[PDB]
Structure 1
Amino acid sequence: RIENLENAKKLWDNANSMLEKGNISGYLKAANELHKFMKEKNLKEDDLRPELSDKTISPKGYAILQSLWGAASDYSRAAATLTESTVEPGLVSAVNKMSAFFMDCKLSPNERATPDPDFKVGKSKILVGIMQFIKDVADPTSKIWMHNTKALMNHKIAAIQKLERSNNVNCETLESVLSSKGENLSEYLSY
């Protein structure tokens, strides 16, 4: 157990270090690694938190986690539609829990985050980062409704990027992308 915890400690540092550099996808993957390892080794937040006494999440990190939290929470619910309400909300919601798990390894219950205002990530930038991560961890056979998940994420990433280029990013236009299940495409997507 002693060395499993120290390997979890370094995996946590790796995610925190990824956070200190604004590497979103890299933070998410490192948090994924940490989570998978603790689940395999049967470690819980309580076990590792004492070992993190001397480590800390910066105001910059808390800023990126808050942006990630806000965007993922809105996306999880917008993606719940009459077409389908489990897989896409599940994927986005699981990203959120993965980031909450990183913080719970470090923080006592109900300890507030102290985010730095000037390091806020704009919601359109986080959303692509979330979709890029989902694209990368989704099973190759994963599907959202009738579409392959990876392929639908690419389509949504491109949709958001098109909105940014034409300077047409608002909650209405973003909600359309997040709620879409590609019903008006000409193919069920695939490899």
Structure 2
Amino acid sequence: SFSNMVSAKKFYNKAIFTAPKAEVSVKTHIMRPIDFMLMGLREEFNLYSEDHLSAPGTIRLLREKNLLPEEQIARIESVYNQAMSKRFELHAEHEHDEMPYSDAKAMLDEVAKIRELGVQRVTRIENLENAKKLWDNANSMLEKGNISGYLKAANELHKFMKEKNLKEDDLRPELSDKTISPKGYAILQSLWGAASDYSRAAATLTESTVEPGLVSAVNKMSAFFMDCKLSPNERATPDPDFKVGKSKILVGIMQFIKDVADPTSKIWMHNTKALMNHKIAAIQKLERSNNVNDETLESVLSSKGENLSEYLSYKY
């Protein structure tokens, strides 16, 4: 949650502690890394028990909730136990915290793996910090009504997470910090409905592949932005007292499709970008008079420019 993962990665960077130059202290090279490594696993997963706060308790929780691969948990257990045994063995003789080099051979080669779980963990946290930003300006574009930018940003968000191999679940915890406006939900609500309409409307007897496909793809992206904030089936709370113009947002979706569609992309007999323009003009023309309604918009959303006389009147 708001359990600063910036600190979880502080505890992880501190554990990453590093190998010896040949000469190895059991405190500074092994037990200390692990104790920070456990506090890192504590702050990353918000590890809470109404009963932590113990090293075995923390290990017990990780197993209970499959928060980490078993092979990786057991490895932390086997090493912390061996460290425990060694500190005791050494405090019972003659340096009390330092041992010979060749004895620690097997232990350190298992600590190196835990350092690998260190970096792998830290990296994804850093990639999550970035995904926090990208989502945060998408919601910020949404906040100021600019639909052009919202769809551009939500796409940049999506592209990053695929690249850095992240999921909706991964981002949701550290988004407890921000909130989507109730009026911002009404925009998303509008965006959702217009796209849902458009996609089905554009499935016609001329063509039912490219155009609905594209429209759905826009709608999934807006849905993906939503999924990043909300849990499965968690309802959205819109402000019905504030509603965006359906014609305005339809043009928005249209602009966005122009920018992301291939130059080689074609809807039926026409180029996709070209048809978007034609459909943009037609609505802007409806907007310019006072003819924008559900019946009259549907006519545009469903057209494939099969009337070439009409389609070609816009060019000349």
* TM-score category of the 2 structures, normalised to the smaller one: over 0.9
1:25-73 superposed Cα distances (whole Å, 9 cap, x missing partner): 1000000000011111110000110111111111121011000001000
- Structure 1 residue 98, shift from structure 2 partner: 0.1
Counterpart for residue 43 of structure 1:
166
What whole-Å deviation, never above 9, does each CA across 1:80-132 have from its counterpart, x for those lacking one? 00111011001111110000000100101111111122331121111111101
TM-superposed deviation, 1:187: 9.7
Q: Is the 8 A contact 2:199 2:216 kept in 1?
A: yes
Q: TM-score, normalised by structure 1?
A: 0.95
Indicate conservation of the 8 Å contact 2:195/2:218, yes or no: yes
Post-superposition offset of 1:158: 0.6
Q: Which moved more, 1:89-98 or 1:136-145?
A: 136-145
Moved more, 165-174 or 80-89: 165-174
| 1:147-158 equivalent positions in 2, closer than 5 A | 147-158=270-281
Moved more, 169-178 or 2-11: 169-178
- Structure 1 residues 16 and 165: alpha-carbon distance in aligned structure 2, compared to 1, 3 A threshold: same
Say whether 1:18 aligns with 2:141.
Answer: yes
- Give unpaired runs (5+ residues) of structure 1: none
Task: Give percent identity, aligned residues only.
Answer: 99
Cα deviation for residue 160 of structure 1 reads: 0.8
Q: 1:137 to 1:172 in 2, by over 3 A?
A: same
Q: Distance in 2 between matches of 1:77 and 1:189?
A: 25
1:73 & 1:64 partners in 2: Cα distance?
14
TM alignment of 1:131-146, pairs within 5 A: 131-146=254-269
Contact 2:278 2:311 in 1 (8 A): no
Q: Normalising by the residue count of structure 2, what TM-score does the alignment of the two structures yield?
A: 0.58
Any conservation in 2 of the 1:131–1:157 contact (CA below 8 Å)? yes
CA apart distance, 1:188: 8.6
Contact 2:201/2:302 (CA < 8 Å) preserved in 1? yes
User: Match of 1:57, SS?
Assistant: coil
The change in CA–CA distance for 1:42 and 1:189 in structure 2 (over 3 A counts) is: farther
Q: How many residues align?
A: 191
**Range with bigger deviation, 180-189 or 153-162:** 180-189
Report the counterpart of residue 60 of structure 1 in structure 2. Answer: 183
Q: CA RMSD in A?
A: 2.0
CA contact (8 A) 1:18 1:26 kept: yes
The answer to whether the 8 A contact 1:131-1:153 is kept is yes
Distance 1:92 1:149 in 2: 12
Which deviates more, 96-105 or 170-179?
170-179
Bigger relative contact order, structure 1 or 2, given CA contacts below 8 A and separation 6+?
Answer: 1
Q: CA deviation at 1:170?
A: 2.0
SS at match of 1:112: coil
Cα 1:181–1:26 change in 2 (3 A) is same
